Amino acid sequence: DAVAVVTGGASGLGLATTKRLLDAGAQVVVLDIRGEDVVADLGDRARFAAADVTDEAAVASALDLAETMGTLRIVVNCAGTGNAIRSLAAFRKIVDINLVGSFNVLRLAAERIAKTEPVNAEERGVIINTASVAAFDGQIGQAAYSASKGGVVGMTLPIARDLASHRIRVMTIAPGLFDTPLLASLPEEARASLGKQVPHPSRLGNPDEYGALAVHIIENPMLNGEVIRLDGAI
Amino acid sequence: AVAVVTGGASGLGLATTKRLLDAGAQVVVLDIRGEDVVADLGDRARFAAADVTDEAAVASALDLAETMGTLRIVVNCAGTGNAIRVLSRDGVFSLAAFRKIVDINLVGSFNVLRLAAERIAKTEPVNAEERGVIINTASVADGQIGQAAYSASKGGVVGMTLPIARDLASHRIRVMTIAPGLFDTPLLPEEARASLGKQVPHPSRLGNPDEYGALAVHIIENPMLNGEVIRLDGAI
Amino acid sequence: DAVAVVTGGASGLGLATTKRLLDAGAQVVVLDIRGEDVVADLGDRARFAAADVTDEAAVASALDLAETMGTLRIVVNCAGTGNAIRSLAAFRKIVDINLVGSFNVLRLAAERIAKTEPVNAEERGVIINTASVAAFDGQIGQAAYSASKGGVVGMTLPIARDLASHRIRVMTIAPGLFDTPLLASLPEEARASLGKQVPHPSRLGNPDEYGALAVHIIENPMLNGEVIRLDGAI
Amino acid sequence: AVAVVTGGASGLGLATTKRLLDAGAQVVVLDIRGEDVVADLGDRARFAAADVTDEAAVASALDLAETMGTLRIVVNCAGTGNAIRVLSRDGVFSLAAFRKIVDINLVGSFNVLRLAAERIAKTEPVNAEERGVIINTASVADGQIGQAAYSASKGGVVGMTLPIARDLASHRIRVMTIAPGLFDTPLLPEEARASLGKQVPHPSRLGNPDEYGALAVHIIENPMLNGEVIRLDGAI
Ligand code: NA
Ligand code: NA
């Protein structure tokens, strides 16, 4: 194929990853809840599947679309929720989207990737998660972001070990402060101030830097069961 | 001093409750059942029926605690107790099961902590250094989806520990987590329980719930333990 | 016996641990490079062995003293070096004392403890390490303290697993900022300022709090292969 | 741009050197031998004989690098290369052996980093964001004392990574660590090498030194990677 599914692929980290994957020659299904126009503009090697990652039936239909395009081998979980702004229902929503959704997509995708022929015939595929944190202290919902981050981190090695016999690697990127629309509710000088708190480089991460790491992980067969912090040492 | 122990009517929570009662705390046992168990514990223990994800029911358990005395201690053992029995009894083989397990562990622990902290923050300190202490339990360990639900739940509880400790520091409430390995609780045949014990390096046996309770009391009694996860697992 | 060996036992964390152990009914060999007077004052259930922990022959002779007193079952590595003050030789000295010394004492003690009868006949003994950090940023020798800390942390689980068949637990305490003579070169208000940086409790740790944890570890059979941070969330 | 690769004449260091040469860097190979290897690498590689714990010899390797161009990159692979061959060839069964292994890993890496950083801090930045990047290797894995020396060495290198990254941030020098698992280097019979490969979950084979080199180059090329340890080990 090779086909990738990128959740949250129509913006931020997901979009940057989608573009890097297209550049690398893969086809991509953008699994997201909006941004059909953005994905249309990328051309017909990227396709849009409308799906909430917490909805099993919706995810399954997006994987079906990927299968029509070629051989499914790659997943990148970049779906997130909640703008950074200065409720048990709110806690639950963040955990459901960032943690449960990532598991849903990982498990359903793994089932299909496991059925493919390996490509020296060593690998069937690679699943990459995103472990996301709160942007700042006293950020609303910090405990939920820390919980869903910890959950994604915690499942990385155990799932890698369970999928080893299927030749599917499982990795996680833990980004720091990145320039995405999730920061767009803060005023500009606030975002600039956040960037300057990062030790080095003292700025916001560019989503392309996340996308570049994701591609490196896909291209490096020895990276498995690991979390990689991508955060300027913050 | 009053404690609330969730999952307090069995296993780790019961062992904790007993240690707390012997140390002079009164205890509200917050659980889905166990009225007889709590009756057998005598006059310094009271029972509150509650699902840890139910805000009103947890609030009422806290109200009960504050009727008995000054609420200073919470130990969240619901993730290992009666509450996960059904969520696990017939196995964990679906995305819906994974979700329910994550819910009780992450949402349940967050609900109990957030509501308890609100009450404890309003108490007077006891060198007038401490208002209280909240201890979480990072899920006890079934198959692959079961392994994932455990590992995600454990991870999430771990992940919240330091950030919440930091948030509550100005309120003089410590936040700690115990991450137990294989323990001998009603949750678990003798041969099958024997095999589990053998994969623990040393001691090569199931943990005694009293060993969990002893650590919980030590955490309570050691002012410098904050924002940390303590694995209690025989190096497994 | 039971006999404990506490390295650095004549001051700070080590002394507080020695006193807690005596109170708990153990006999103690204080393995240290000075403080014979302090140990004399504790009475004849504490004995002094003059030894540098980097010197194998010296350590062995201290273990010999412990054996004459009773059955050796407990080791607490609290020997440290260098006052906190605001050189490759200096880097090497910190690593040699804090990391190599701890390994030296652990390995030599383990050999003897392994030969004892277990005491329901589950345990032969317990070895506790101290993983110490720099007190503040820009502290001279910070990289060496971080290296020797990381080294002690890194060896904890692997050594616990290798000693499991001998029924010897191996644990590590990672203290934060404690009121010991290692801070005595900083002026008082500087130490007070450091204490206030600790989130909660916002003060310097009391060495007795370390000693209490060490005793709890000894008394809790399920604690093995783990590092416990004791640091007020700093 | 000039790089210094310690242990650069074999294994992980050689694979890194080759990747760097293909990416357009000149490379000083700092090693205890390998003049012929470096000659075969051609005119953009030069050889400096040095023990990584020898301040004068490392200083001279740095002098050589700065003669060739602007020093921006250091990759410390000496802990996995020619330098540990003898320290390990006849086994690790003494406290003196443990010490020597810790020395080369912790002291060696600190010596190279501290001296390299002093030079790199004085260069002009290249959006004028970066002066340079230093990458450490957290020991490759023999028996119990061997296991302890490995684990302590790895731990120490890991432990220094973030604090040093923080210290060097104002100088625009990133500090990263790669923690490799079982790799196929000259250090390692086919059957015995086969058995080692099988205990890696996936890929269930020894790592190819080129996979280490590819990660090192990615770290160099990704401005946001700082203060972090990356395990490269097939989930072992
Ligand atoms: Na811990
Ligand atoms: Na990592």
Cβ distance C88 to D55 less than 8 Å, yes or no, reads: yes
Q: Which ligand is in closest contact with the Cα of D177?
A: 2
Rounded Cα distance between A210 and A128, Å, is 11
- Nearest beta carbon to residue C160 from set B201, B227, B228: B201
Residue that has been written with the tokens 């989930």 in this structure: D235
Distance from CA of A233 to the nearest CA of D (A): 5
| Nearest one of A144, A32, A61, A50 to A99, comparing CA atoms | A144
* Cβ–Cβ < 8 Å for C224, C125: no
- List of chain D residues whose C-beta atoms are within 8 Å of the C-beta of residue A212: 218, 221-222
Do chains A and D have 3 or more beta-carbon pairs under 8 angstroms?
yes
Catalytic residue among C48, C145, C178, C210: C145
Distance from CA of C177 to the nearest CA of B (A): 10
Positive/negative CA dihedral, C17, C22, C27, C29: positive
| Nearest one of D174, D169, D166, D157 to D78, comparing CA atoms | D157
Q: How many contacts, defined by CB atoms under 8 Å, are there between A and D?
A: 122
Catalytic residue among A14, A71, A127, A145: A145
Residue that has been written with the tokens 């317990």 in this structure: C126
- List of chain D residues whose C-beta atoms are within 8 Å of the C-beta of residue A230: 222, 224-225, 228
Residue A154 one-letter amino acid: G
B141 token code pair: 């360990």
- Nearest beta carbon to residue D107 from set C88, C142, C162: C88
C127 token code pair: 């070895």
Chains sharing 3 or more CB pairs under 8 A with chain B:
A, C
* Cβ–Cβ < 8 Å for A199, D173: no
Burial class, D37, CB count within 10 angstroms (exposed 0-12 / middle 13-18 / buried 19+): middle
Cβ distance C147 to D99 less than 8 Å, yes or no, reads: no
Cβ distance C224 to B214 less than 8 Å, yes or no, reads: no
**Helix (H), strand (E) at residue B68:** helix B55-68
- List of chain C residues whose C-beta atoms are within 8 Å of the C-beta of residue D103: 92, 95
Rounded Cα distance between B166 and A97, Å, is 25
Q: Is the omega angle on the peptide bond into residue D203 within 30 degrees of 0, that is, cis?
A: yes
**Helix (H), strand (E) at residue B28:** strand B26-31
Q: Which ligand is in closest contact with the Cα of C230?
A: 1
Cβ distance B110 to A154 less than 8 Å, yes or no, reads: no
Q: How many contacts, defined by CB atoms under 8 Å, are there between C and D?
A: 99
Domain positions in chain D are 1-236
Active site residue A145: yes
Residue A47 one-letter amino acid: R
C39 token code pair: 């140990």
Q: How many contacts, defined by CB atoms under 8 Å, are there between A and B?
A: 99
For residue D136, report the phi and psi dihedrals to the nearest 5 degrees: -100, 160
D191: CB partners within 8 A, 6+ apart: none
Chains sharing 3 or more CB pairs under 8 A with chain A:
B, D
Cβ distance D159 to C144 less than 8 Å, yes or no, reads: no
C29 token code pair: 């060999």
Q: Is the omega angle on the peptide bond into residue C158 within 30 degrees of 0, that is, cis?
A: no
Experimental technique: X-ray
* Cβ–Cβ < 8 Å for D15, D23: no
B43: CB partners within 8 A, 6+ apart: none
Please state which CATH number belongs to domain C1-234.
3.40.50.720
* Cβ–Cβ < 8 Å for D227, D176: yes
**Helix (H), strand (E) at residue C107:** helix C101-113
Give the residue from D140, D164, D173, D202 with the most A CB atoms within 10 Å of its CB, the best one to mutate.
Answer: D202
The residues with which D135 forms a beta bridge, in sequence order, are: D75, D176
Rounded Cα distance between B51 and B112, Å, is 10
Cβ distance C213 to B203 less than 8 Å, yes or no, reads: no
Q: How far is the CA of C118 from the centre of ligand 1 (A)?
A: 27
Q: Which ligand is in closest contact with the Cα of A223?
A: 2
Cβ distance B202 to C230 less than 8 Å, yes or no, reads: no
* Cβ–Cβ < 8 Å for B10, B78: no
- List of chain B residues whose C-beta atoms are within 8 Å of the C-beta of residue A88: 53, 55, 107, 110-111, 114
Helix axis angle for C101-113 and D95-102, nearest 10°, is: 150
Q: Which ligand is in closest contact with the Cα of A228?
A: 2
| Nearest one of A94, A105, A128, A101 to A219, comparing CA atoms | A128
Task: Give the residue on D whose Cα is nearest the Cα of A229.
Answer: D228
Rounded Cα distance between D187 and D206, Å, is 12
For residue C77, report the phi and psi dihedrals to the nearest 5 degrees: -80, 105
The dihedral formed by the CA atoms of D206, D210, D212 and D216, expressed in degrees to the nearest 10: -170
Q: Is the omega angle on the peptide bond into residue B223 within 30 degrees of 0, that is, cis?
A: no
Rounded Cα distance between B198 and B209, Å, is 18
Helix axis angle for B82-89 and B95-102, nearest 10°, is: 170
- Nearest beta carbon to residue D222 from set A167, A209, A219: A209
C83: CB partners within 8 A, 6+ apart: C181, C182, C183, C184, C185
Cβ distance B202 to C167 less than 8 Å, yes or no, reads: yes
- Nearest beta carbon to residue C233 from set B129, B205, B226: B226
Cα→Cα distances B155→A196, B140, C61, Å: 30, 12, 46
Rounded Cα distance between B184 and B11, Å, is 8
Neighbours of B35 (CB within 10 A): 12
Rounded Cα distance between C170 and C151, Å, is 14
Cα→Cα distances C138→B210, C145, D107, D164, Å: 44, 12, 19, 10
- List of chain D residues whose C-beta atoms are within 8 Å of the C-beta of residue C95: 102-103, 106-107, 156
* SS3 label, residue C86: coil
Distance from CA of B73 to the nearest CA of C (A): 16
Rounded Cα distance between D20 and D27, Å, is 7
A101: CB partners within 8 A, 6+ apart: A7, A52, A53, A54, A77, A79
- List of chain A residues whose C-beta atoms are within 8 Å of the C-beta of residue D227: 199, 229, 231-233
Task: Give the residue on B whose Cα is nearest the Cα of C225.
Answer: B235
Rounded Cα distance between B183 and B232, Å, is 10
| Nearest one of C180, C162, C178 to C170, comparing CA atoms | C162
Rounded Cα distance between A169 and D116, Å, is 36
- List of chain B residues whose C-beta atoms are within 8 Å of the C-beta of residue A100: 95, 98-99, 102
Rounded Cα distance between C116 and C1, Å, is 11
Catalytic residue among D110, D150, D183, D212: D150
Residue that has been written with the tokens 């609420």 in this structure: B71
Task: Give the residue on A whose Cα is nearest the Cα of B100.
Answer: A100
Q: Which residues of B are catalytic?
A: 150
Give the class (CATH, top level) of D1-236: alpha beta
Cβ distance A164 to D204 less than 8 Å, yes or no, reads: yes
- List of chain B residues whose C-beta atoms are within 8 Å of the C-beta of residue A149: 159
| Nearest one of D59, D69, D18 to D41, comparing CA atoms | D18
- List of chain A residues whose C-beta atoms are within 8 Å of the C-beta of residue B55: 88
Distance from CA of B77 to the nearest CA of C (A): 18
Query: In angstroms, how far apart are the furthest CA atoms of chain C?
Result: 51
CA terminus-to-terminus distance, chain A: 38
Within 13 Å of residue C140, how many CA atoms lie on the same side as its CB? Answer: 13
Cβ distance D110 to C103 less than 8 Å, yes or no, reads: no
| Nearest one of D229, B61, B72, B154 to C154, comparing CA atoms | D229
Neighbours of A129 (CB within 10 A): 28
Task: Give the residue on C whose Cα is nearest the Cα of B232.
Answer: C223
| Nearest one of B99, B80, B197, B203 to B146, comparing CA atoms | B99
CA angle, A26 then A27 then A31, to 5°: 125
- List of chain C residues whose C-beta atoms are within 8 Å of the C-beta of residue B234: 222, 224-225
Rounded Cα distance between B218 and B233, Å, is 17
| Nearest one of C224, C84, C226 to C152, comparing CA atoms | C226
Distance from CA of C6 to the nearest CA of D (A): 20
C128: CB partners within 8 A, 6+ apart: C74, C75, C76, C77, C170, C171, C172, C173, C214, C217, C218
| Strand pairing category for C27-32 and C3-7 | parallel
User: How do the residues of chain D divide into helix, strand and coil, expressed in percent and rounded to 5?
Assistant: 50, 20, 30
Q: How far is the CA of C107 from the centre of ligand 2 (A)?
A: 30
Residue that has been written with the tokens 């990574």 in this structure: D161
